[PDB]
From a paper:
A large subfamily of one-metal-ion-dependent nucleases consist of histidine-metal (His-Me) nucleases that perform critical tasks in biological pathways such as apoptosis, extracellular defense, intracellular immunity (CRISPR–Cas9), and intron homing (homing endonuclease). Surrounded by two beta sheets and an alpha helix, the His-Me nucleases active sites all contain a single metal ion, a histidine, and an asparagine. The asparagine residue helps to stabilize metal ion binding whereas the strictly conserved histidine is suggested to deprotonate a nearby water for nucleophilic attack toward the scissile phosphate.
Because His98 has been proposed to primarily activate the nucleophilic water, we first mutated His98 to alanine. However, to our surprise, the metal ion-binding site was devoid of any anomalous signal. Our results indicate that perturbing the deprotonation pathway not only affects nucleophilic attack but also metal binding, suggesting that I-PpoI catalyzes DNA catalysis via a concerted mechanism.
Numbering used by the authors:
A (entry chain A): 2 to 163
B (entry chain B): 202 to 363
The structure:
DNA sequence: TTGACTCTCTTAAGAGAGTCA
DNA sequence: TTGACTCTCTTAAGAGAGTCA
């Protein structure tokens, strides 16, 4: 098994490589009618992506290192959390993009939480609009708002009460 | 089936059958420290379920009627909305349960919206805690709250800024 | 040891369609 | 015509593992 030192070395190699990705400045809603700025470190759209990186899906990548003749591989966003517990409350931990930008690999834009917590950030009003997440959101979620509901609750007869 | 009169016939027969389901009272959080009461009309746990109804999955059912000697079938929760557009902004319309109770078929607890809008109601603060859904929620979402994040954003070196 | 491809799987909100009696 | 079962698929947030040179 990899030692703590080997794991830290893996995290260091990842940061050095991701830190050289193109840095894109984005203006984003924060909630409460305010605007902020996020700086995303974005993996390239096509190969080559960077030392150790390869694409396994349309917006999925993996990071690979060979140690003592053995090949090790991790999801490209999971590396910052290799020294953390990998489950909580019986649920698997997942890399959760606070910037909602799948190509970004900035570890300051990622957290480590259940898939339900991860998903729910899509609808959060944001750090200046009422976010109650203990690890606070960086921006208002892209899907927050009144929605586009086609038809509401309704009945034709009188069989039902609310 | 095809004509307006036949579709109205399907909706009326469905309302009559579901109107005989057992009515179960559920007390629910509304947000803002307040509580309300909903009356769900719950499909039985095992067969028989009711005229026209059959189970295709653990929490999935279908309604079936024979019209013009042909069998027509729909998802158990879609029948109230058979006269509505079946898409919006190029996204499929889905039956969304405002009471978050899958066995419930009370049409006063259903709406018709994209799968993203549907999912997002799981994290809404509720009608007394700040819901902004244009078709308003009936309760606070079951997954609303601070979350259980294991690790927050972090870096080991000095290569990244927020 | 490394790059650039290939394939299938998980979750929880939702679906369509076939086999028998 | 009606009832009671069987199977796989969709979406968008996430994953693991094989092949070849
Ligand atoms: Na996310
Ligand atoms: Na729902
Ligand atoms: Zn980012
Ligand atoms: Zn938040
Ligand atoms: Zn209900
Ligand atoms: Zn709401």
């Amino acid at each position: 098994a990899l030692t703590n030192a080997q794991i830290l070395a893996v995290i260091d190699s990842w940061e050095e490589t991701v830190g050289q990705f193109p840095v894109i400045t984005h203006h984003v809603p924060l909630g409460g009618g305010l605007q902020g700025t996020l700086h995303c470190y974005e993996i390239p759209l096509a190969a080559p992506y960077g030392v150790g990186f390869a694409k396994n899906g349309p917006t999925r990548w993996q990071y690979k290192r060979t140690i003592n003749q053995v090949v090790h591989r991790w999801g490209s966003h999971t590396v910052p959390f290799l020294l953390e517990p990998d489950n909580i409350n019986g649920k698997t931990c997942t890399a959760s993009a606070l910037c909602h930008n799948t190509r970004c690999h900035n570890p300051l834009h990622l957290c480590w939480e259940s898939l339900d917590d991860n998903k729910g950030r899509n609808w959060c009003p944001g750090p200046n609009g009422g976010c109650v997440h203990a690890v606070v959101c960086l921006r208002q979620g892209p899907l927050y708002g009144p929605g586009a509901t086609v038809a509401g609750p309704q009945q034709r007869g009188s069989h039902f009460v609310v």
